[PDB]
Design an enzyme around this catalytic site. Structure first.
Site, PDB file in Angstrom:
ATOM      1  N   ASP A  29     -50.560  69.480 -49.349  1.00  0.00           N
ATOM      2  CA  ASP A  29     -49.395  70.720 -49.798  1.00  0.00           C
ATOM      3  C   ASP A  29     -49.038  71.423 -48.581  1.00  0.00           C
ATOM      4  O   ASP A  29     -47.775  71.570 -48.283  1.00  0.00           O
ATOM      5  CB  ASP A  29     -49.643  71.528 -51.064  1.00  0.00           C
ATOM      6  N   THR A  41     -52.903  72.344 -53.584  1.00  0.00           N
ATOM      7  CA  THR A  41     -52.572  73.276 -54.791  1.00  0.00           C
ATOM      8  C   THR A  41     -52.644  72.528 -55.893  1.00  0.00           C
ATOM      9  O   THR A  41     -51.815  71.477 -56.277  1.00  0.00           O
ATOM     10  CB  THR A  41     -51.274  73.972 -54.942  1.00  0.00           C
ATOM     11  N   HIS A  47     -56.158  67.256 -62.122  1.00  0.00           N
ATOM     12  CA  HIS A  47     -57.388  67.000 -61.217  1.00  0.00           C
ATOM     13  C   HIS A  47     -58.786  67.570 -61.996  1.00  0.00           C
ATOM     14  O   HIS A  47     -59.756  67.690 -61.360  1.00  0.00           O
ATOM     15  CB  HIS A  47     -57.038  67.988 -60.064  1.00  0.00           C
TER      16      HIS A  47
END
Ligand SMILES: [Zn+2]
Length: 134
Positions: A29, A41, A47
């Site tokens: 990012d 992020t 995730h």
């Protein structure tokens, strides 16, 4: 999904940075060439974080768990490839950035300042502070 908070915080620290950089593994990012570090992020659902934002869907459960497991394996390989190339990696989890338990700009700013400019080892930030990645 570019994080407004972080672009303005990095800008305020006097740093130059690239965003959503497709030239590096994982398309990080933010990338700060001057301090050889990249920042991801990550969403806590996608995730597979261990916090209160992670919820197992009630529909097609097995399908979702398998898919999110594969995301995690892909994240581990991107992070290894970055480190082999000489980059330090920071993950700022979504739970630290938004929602009920998010960090203040002041706490978040101080952790970023120490980790970037103090050359800290790869790490991750959540609602409980900063932790090494390994
Ligand atoms: Zn989280």
């Amino acid at each position: 999904a570019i994080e407004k908070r972080l672009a303005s915080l990095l800008t305020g620290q006097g740093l130059a940075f690239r965003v959503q950089d497709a030239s590096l593994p994982g398309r990080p990012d933010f990338v700060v060439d001057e301090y050889r570090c990249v920042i991801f992020t990550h969403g806590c659902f996608w995730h597979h974080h261990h916090c209160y934002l992670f919820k197992v869907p009630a529909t097609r459960t097995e399908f979702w768990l398998e898919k999110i497991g594969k995301n995690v394996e892909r994240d581990r390989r991107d992070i290894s490839r970055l480190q082999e190339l000489g980059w330090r990696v920071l993950i700022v989890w979504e739970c630290a950035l938004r929602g009920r338990e998010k960090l203040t700009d002041e706490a978040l700013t101080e952790r970023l300042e120490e980790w970037i400019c103090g050359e800290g080892a790869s790490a991750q930030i959540d609602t409980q502070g900063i932790h090494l990645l390994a």
